[PDB]
Design a protein around this ligand. Structure first.
Ligand SMILES: O=C(O)c1cc(S)ccc1[N+](=O)[O-]
Length: 222
């Protein structure tokens, strides 16, 4: 295979994995490709990629590049089967971003509700059986989805995008707003339990502190 170096943002010691959810997304893509690569952290905007001596910089170009040039059969395809696997998480980070930046405590419930509404949209998607889901015993569509991840039972590009952002939301909102993702979002929790069991996700996460540091001067209410 090719010679690859991924440059990611460094954490507060200038060495550890810092909070950069697109860097984690690319780290996941390369890991899931099953390709050799090195990861370098930068105490400097990341991620950047060196692929056979060429510097690449535009994330979208990079993601397209990798999916197209690291292809089957040597490498797994990572594009999701269903376009909505991508589309479901579209406003979730923005709602979190407004919630975590709000400094008016009496507005907290309104911003939290707006975040919960997006989590509900995600939960519904994760509970709705995909068109390809067939119960192995009855051959009926299951009544509630059982698939591991967004698109099916493998990690896809959808998950490499969404998972890093959900980790940030989970960590930062718990730290600064005492927020827990409701237990009643059983679809969301099944997905998170499955994801946190995969090392491509957990071992590319920065330490929670790095994410807490990102929000330390925005999330304190006044
Ligand atoms: O980067 C985002 O905020 C994001 C945007 C869209 S349109 C879909 C999924 C996403 N995920 O997964 O994070």
């Amino acid at each position: 295979d090719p010679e690859i170096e991924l440059f990611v943002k460094a954490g507060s010691d200038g060495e550890s994995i810092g909070n950069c959810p697109f860097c984690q997304r690319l780290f996941m893509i390369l890991w899931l490709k099953g390709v050799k690569f090195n990861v370098t952290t930068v105490d400097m905007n990341p991620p950047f990629l060196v692929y056979n001596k060429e510097l690449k910089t535009d994330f979208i170009k990079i993601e397209e590049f990798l999916e197209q040039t690291l292809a089957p059969p040597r490498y797994p395809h990572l594009s999701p089967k269903y376009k909505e696997s991508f589309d479901v998480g579209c406003n979730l980070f923005a709602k979190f971003s407004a919630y975590i930046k709000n400094t008016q405590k009496e507005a907290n419930k309104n911003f939290e509700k707006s975040l919960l509404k997006e989590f509900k949209r995600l939960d519904d998607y994760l509970n709705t059986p995909l068109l390809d889901e067939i119960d192995p015993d009855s051959a009926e569509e299951p009544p509630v989805s059982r698939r591991l991840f967004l698109d099916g039972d493998q990690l896809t590009l959808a998950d490499c995008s969404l998972l890093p952002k959900l980790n940030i939301i989970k960590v930062a909102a718990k730290k600064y707003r005492d927020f827990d993702i409701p237990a009643e979002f059983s679809g969301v929790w099944r997905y998170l339990h499955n994801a946190y069991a995969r090392e491509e996700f957990t071992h590319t996460c920065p330490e929670d502190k790095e994410i807490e540091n990102t929000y330390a001067n925005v999330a304190k209410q006044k």
